[PDB]
Write a protein that binds this ligand. Structure first.
Ligand SMILES: CC(C)(COP(=O)(O)OP(=O)(O)OC[C@H]1O[C@@H](n2cnc3c(N)ncnc32)[C@H](O)[C@@H]1OP(=O)(O)O)[C@H](O)C(=O)NCCC(=O)NCCS
Ligand SMILES: CC(C)(COP(=O)(O)OP(=O)(O)OC[C@H]1O[C@@H](n2cnc3c(N)ncnc32)[C@H](O)[C@@H]1OP(=O)(O)O)[C@H](O)C(=O)NCCC(=O)NCCS
Ligand SMILES: CC(C)(COP(=O)(O)OP(=O)(O)OC[C@H]1O[C@@H](n2cnc3c(N)ncnc32)[C@H](O)[C@@H]1OP(=O)(O)O)[C@H](O)C(=O)NCCC(=O)NCCS
Ligand SMILES: CC(C)(COP(=O)(O)OP(=O)(O)OC[C@H]1O[C@@H](n2cnc3c(N)ncnc32)[C@H](O)[C@@H]1OP(=O)(O)O)[C@H](O)C(=O)NCCC(=O)NCCS
Ligand SMILES: CC(=O)N[C@@H](CCC(=O)O)C(=O)O
Ligand SMILES: CC(=O)N[C@@H](CCC(=O)O)C(=O)O
Ligand SMILES: CC(=O)N[C@@H](CCC(=O)O)C(=O)O
Ligand SMILES: CC(=O)N[C@@H](CCC(=O)O)C(=O)O
Lengths: 424, 424, 424, 424
């Protein structure tokens, strides 16, 4: 495929990723092989594409490679590596040689790269009667300082080391350092660059996209390591991060291909914000009426009525928060078994603009589909593009279900008509 | 070829083009067909890639399309279209419908797009007894205002219309408006988006790259239109612009492919700054000595001598400005007919850092090559990377011409040795 | 009258209008005659006087002038002109020739003038079974971009055209575009430059100033056009704009004379914020007591008492929001039928500083006046200037009603005394 | 001595050192002992006192401590340590453990500390037939980036490592890295924190202050190490740095005591800018006349004359640049052998304000003193404070030498009279 076409494809993801903040937690194996030059390069490019970068690396696998081979053996607890004064000493060494090679590798393939005492750690203390010693976790993170450097366009490099006010240095767990740093920054995107093609489902297939929930539920049968990715990824999301990804950093160019294709090459994970949508029943009707009535008076909605509603209350859905009714949507059906209609779609003007409408539309389309409906219509007098923009084609009178074509004729409204093909 | 590989290729040109200013002069035919959506898109992307954009369009072909078809016939003079009060009136119309379609087309494929009274025109007046009437040329261009908008990241749109202080509006020639605007902005790059795959040489082949000189000399036998491109492109360059390009705007994605590949798809043109390099002769020697001597005292250069030089003054070149000697370089030869050496390469410390060294290196390599030399050596004690960076590989003692290997041994200097393969 | 005196008069309105934002909706007839040079000039001056300017123009009258004269006839619906693909095409033309003439006219009488894709439209869709086609209304307005340009001192020019995300361009109604833009900007002032000396009352007299309410009520018997001015002017105000004006843009210099004289030459309209003020009755007394008591303990208010109040509860007014009592004020009377006193004026410290005090003062003065009172006194120990500033002159003991002069003597407070002449 | 008095003493040096840039080159032994906490603390304080800090550390002594103890033995050349791929590897380790301890030590005694890829090195190459291998020197130093961080108030930390464009990392000599960095920054002050109480004179006494010249001349008989301090300190100065100091970083609190006392505790070094001052002779007189005459016409100088001057040309000095005469000053003597007068002090108005006047004053006072003069008078009608400010006390008529008191009386000028006691 041609250059121009690849470039024209990436264009939209470049748009999206621009001026946005991307926290990367990098396995330290990656900072060592031939795999490091590829990765620094891909990261220069990101910088070039106007993405704000914070980069954090781990040390566990290097330490052990030095441990097992010193005679000693590392214990982990809940995953967290007990770190003594000698391991801590090597982690300080490992960080200097890494930060320096990554620098060279980046300078060799004028991109400004900045490191900082942005972190204050406290020791994790004791877990299940075990002194973790120098194992830290982040107590404070100098957010203003960081934004300042990202504002200026510097790529931030962070080793897995914080300092405490007592003048002691602690060893930080990369995986949950990064996620903590992302939540501080409210970064749009946390990326973990592992040695694995993402997270696998119950049977060997790699999980392309997952809700925090699905992620959660894969964990019960998942391996230590991928279990802790999942929790930090879940916590990063609930903490405000928009999207956390898992890639194989060792696979050539994966970062690019993940960020700037319609496809990807790893797992990505997203949080399903709260919205209780359910089958309307007898009690909603006064609410729905109050919601519906203003609109049905402006001419934006067909005029309904207590009995209309009372007798079709089953074809309606409502969206609710805290007992409060914020929206509704109904599915009409027809003698044509393939057809359907989104009807009576309404969100309160107060609670508008946060994807409520969308959620009801989606919901209905799930329901139209569970009954073998494959074309969904939507007619509208002042709102057509909401649907044109969200996957509906223009249609004519002659295309409606026969009956709906009758009503349409003797409406007098001339609503615009649209449809959207639903998928099996 | 894979995505990642295309992207990894563009990466360097993205680096270069970033934060840089690109003035585009666009034929107005392009703002009309299906060719406009492609082009707006490609231009959104540029914006996305951090390039400062100023865009200017023409009107000549639209006017005439309206003229010939009104009964009237346009005269041009030296290429400049006499424009009456009615043509001027239509150009104002044409500009509003263009700026608005390009807007829609860009909004449809959140990129900020800004238009401005940045130009003050005066009428061209009379040429060869002919009143050009409303044909303007730019008298002043509000540069601070423009930088301000580019600083903020707006894409600047400019119609081919300026206003004069007497309250009159003039019609501007696109081709030399853009080049004028670029010189004001000192833009790095002026791009002309024509209906032609660039400029053709004496025999049908498209001229990939050209010096302003070669450009110049193609003009004597070239067609009106491409003659005026050439002059404005020459004037833009001498006026300070770094590089002017000519592409076919109608060819799909050409802009991208031009800017972000090692290849291209149009013509590009560059100015050969002034440097008089010539065969050293008897008179230079005191100069060369003064230049050479400090260095030959620090140990950076083999030690020469009046007679050494006097008897080999033919193997030397010198670089000179205003009778002043600013650098030198010599080509040694050997019993091996394929071999050569760059020797005695020196630029004054005052006049360093502007590509003087490079120019002498190049020069010598032209000369080594005109005598069938295909490997050029360079030995150096403190300056090796200058050559490693500029296309030389490391070598060993055992690889030198036999004689030079002798001298090398009984030097005691241990110079590093490098070579570079010259091309037929 | 002398220069200096005119200038010294304008000085205060210049103070007020400085650094303030003024959205102007301009009838497009104005952009055409000799009336355009005058108007551009007056608008340069505004810019010179440090006023932030956004200017938006209409197209309806031009379109029709082209329509009726093409054979075709425009339908309007609720005032909104159905606009086809050919009208939309001309509106794009009309905008380019206008923006360009206004530019020339402004450049001819160095004031920076900036145009922008600040608007995203959606089509109005269908009204009363009628496809409005390309008739848009503004869906989003890039407010940050606009403030940015106004911050820099540019005059913003806006044609009556937005674009939609589907890549289509819509025709915008000027009158309610401007008001929408003002509300976005929260501009202090929206000015509509019409062809009429403002809005006329029930009997031929031009309405100098009006509350949104009075405006509203003039509408029931008013003409289509002036009916829609009124609604957009009402909506702009409720939407947050401080003041909307209606002038005759064709009348020479009206804009100046409107903005910088104590008088004006058109209609102006202002919103009466919410304040329920009413006759105190038996139930308020505990509230009034709690409000009054702290103050009556600091020495700022004469000391009252349950019975005092109980027996004069008729001379009191209270101000209330949401059943909450936020202030009070009483009118005392005297054997002198011309006299009155503002007594017991108090607002809670929480709800202070928003013109509550003023509203009660006003209120009382309405009431003093409805009983033929023409001098209102106010005595005060620590608050005299509140009244000196708000239209009261200093007075002496010997000027009080005889009885109040008695009380004053044997007070011991030495309150300052002031008065204000009320008008028939 | 009391707190207040110490603080009131430091106040002036705090004034001077504020907002000023201080580059510190630190021996790496210092980053290790108990000596590190003291030093980080003193450096926090500096930061607190508004001084811009760049800090750079060495590695030579650590490397060798690892070398001698590995079996290997380091060669130095001209002082520069040949560094192989394994030493370079350890220097990367040493830098990470240092930067991290200094961090902890600073965090333990909220001061922001910033590290950066500010340096690009090239290898030193070959010296006297010896491959220095990975021994670098700085080729480019990102000055804008550095000022940016100092502007923001960050303390800059720099390890002794740069990177080259070929993707290789080099080992930098601390001593001449710092001085190079200072010259780039044009820092006011370069401080070298050694293990020695400054530089010793020919006989064991520590050299408090030295001109670059005196420094220079101490070097001929000085030890390798202190020889290279001297050259880098000389080059930093000629390169534009205002003042370079040498202290014992291991001595407790020396940095403070050096910077904020009238005394110090180490050596300091300063450059004697160019000014040729010499005994006036017959040829200067026309110059001196032209210089003198305007002034002698304004009344600022006693009126002289060709013969006056011709016959006393020995009591005059002149200051000259490039054969050009820019100033003059004369010493009068008296029957009182202790007395003297500065007479005829004049600098051209063009070349004023750069300490020329001062230099002539000094000069004369050297000359008055070499003839046993211990009081120097200066009389002046419009210039008294120049002398009051520069160490002269007010005097009366009755205090002048007897003869000068005569002239003074029958002048009519009433010059102010001042004196200054010169020291044996
Ligand atoms: C259309 C509606 C139901 C969407 O509800 P919502 O919860 O705001 O929906 P979402 O937040 O998912 O989408 C909001 C977005 O849709 C856009 N939208 C809202 N009204 C629009 C319209 N009439 N035309 C086009 N787009 C519109 C909003 O501008 C907003 O744009 P953005 O994505 O660039 O911010 C709307 O809120 C509503 O109730 N309008 C009046 C009732 C109506 O038209 N109902 C049925 C139509 S037949
Ligand atoms: C090498 C030299 C001749 C280049 O001359 P020049 O006119 O400055 O050459 P150019 O301007 O084309 O190239 C200058 C660039 O080369 C780089 N350069 C200069 N000396 C360098 C060196 N010793 N090592 C690596 N790069 C060096 C400069 O840093 C500058 O870097 P930049 O491209 O990132 O700005 C140099 O100026 C010189 O005379 N040095 C001393 C003499 C010497 O070494 N002569 C022969 C070497 S065997
Ligand atoms: C005087 C008072 C009743 C005004 O109430 P209010 O609702 O704040 O009145 P407004 O908001 O219309 O006017 C507020 C302004 O009046 C000014 N004002 C308030 N107290 C003032 C005083 N004692 N002297 C002068 N001006 C005063 C406020 O500073 C504010 O100034 P600004 O216009 O530059 O912002 C005041 O709030 C109050 O109750 N003070 C104590 C009670 C008292 O003095 N009552 C009667 C006086 S005899
Ligand atoms: C006084 C003079 C000789 C000093 O020469 P100079 O080379 O400028 O001396 P310096 O640069 O060392 O000192 C310059 C400073 O002295 C100050 N100075 C100059 N004239 C001054 C005066 N008349 N009163 C007080 N200070 C003065 C300048 O303002 C400048 O102030 P700064 O230290 O805050 O910048 C002056 O330049 C001069 O020639 N003035 C007229 C001739 C004259 O008065 N000669 C003899 C006086 S009896
Ligand atoms: C999608 C939607 O809510 N449609 C409106 C009908 C609009 C019309 O038919 O013209 C409804 O009443 O269901
Ligand atoms: C390229 C160059 O100028 N070389 C130096 C030689 C350096 C050496 O041989 O060690 C020259 O004298 O020609
Ligand atoms: C205006 C007002 O509220 N006055 C205070 C009286 C102040 C006085 O008389 O000194 C009042 O009690 O009515
Ligand atoms: C210091 C100096 O130059 N003095 C002036 C004299 C000023 C006076 O005596 O009043 C001089 O002629 O020497």
């Amino acid at each position: 495929d041609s250059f121009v076409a690849h470039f024209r494809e990436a264009a939209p993801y470049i748009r999206q990723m621009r001026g946005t903040t991307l926290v990367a937690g990098i396995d330290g194996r990656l900072l060592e092989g031939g795999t490091l030059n590829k990765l620094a390069a891909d990261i220069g490019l990101l910088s070039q594409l106007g993405i704000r970068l914070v980069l954090i690396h781990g040390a566990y696998h290097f330490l052990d490679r030095l441990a097992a081979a010193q005679g000693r053996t590392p214990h982990y607890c809940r995953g967290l590596r007990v770190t003594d004064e000698t391991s801590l000493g090597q982690a300080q060494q490992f960080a200097g040689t890494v930060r320096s090679r990554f620098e060279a590798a980046l300078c060799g393939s004028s991109v400004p790269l900045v490191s900082g005492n942005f972190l204050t750690a406290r020791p994790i203390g004791v877990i299940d009667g075990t002194d973790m010693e120098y194992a830290g976790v982040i107590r404070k993170t100098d957010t203003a300082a960081l934004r300042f450097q990202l504002d200026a366009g510097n790529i931030v490099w962070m080793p897995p080391l914080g300092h405490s006010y007592g003048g002691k240095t602690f060893n930080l767990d990369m995986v949950q350092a990064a996620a903590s740093v992302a939540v501080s920054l409210q970064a749009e995107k946390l990326v973990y660059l592992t040695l694995s093609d993402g997270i696998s489902r119950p049977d060997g297939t790699l999980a392309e996209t997952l809700s925090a929930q699905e992620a959660q539920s894969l964990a019960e049968h998942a391996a230590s390591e991928t279990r802790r990715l999942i929790s930090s990824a879940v916590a990063a999301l609930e903490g405000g991060v928009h999207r956390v990804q898992i890639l194989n950093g060792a696979a050539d160019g994966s970062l690019l291909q993940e960020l700037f294709t319609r496809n990807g090459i790893g797992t990505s994970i997203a949080k399903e914000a709260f919205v209780s949508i359910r089958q309307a029943h007898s009690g909603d009707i006064p609410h729905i009426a109050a919601l519906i009535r203003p609109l049905e008076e402006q001419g934006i909605l067909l005029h309904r009525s207590r009995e209309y509603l009372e007798n079709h209350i089953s074809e309606f859905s409502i969206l609710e928060h805290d007992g409060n009714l914020y929206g509704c949507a109904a599915l009409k059906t027809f003698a044509e078994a393939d057809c359907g209609e989104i009807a009576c779609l309404a969100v309160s003007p107060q609670a508008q603009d946060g994807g409520y409408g969308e959620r009801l539309l989606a919901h209905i389309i799930d329901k139209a589909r569970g009954i073998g409906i494959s074309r969904l219509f939507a007619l509208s007098t002042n709102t057509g593009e909401w649907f044109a923009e969200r996957g509906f084609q223009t249609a004519s009178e002659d295309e409606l279900p026969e009956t709906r074509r009758k009503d349409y004729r003797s409406n007098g409204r001339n609503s615009h008509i649209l449809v959207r093909r639903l998928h099996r």
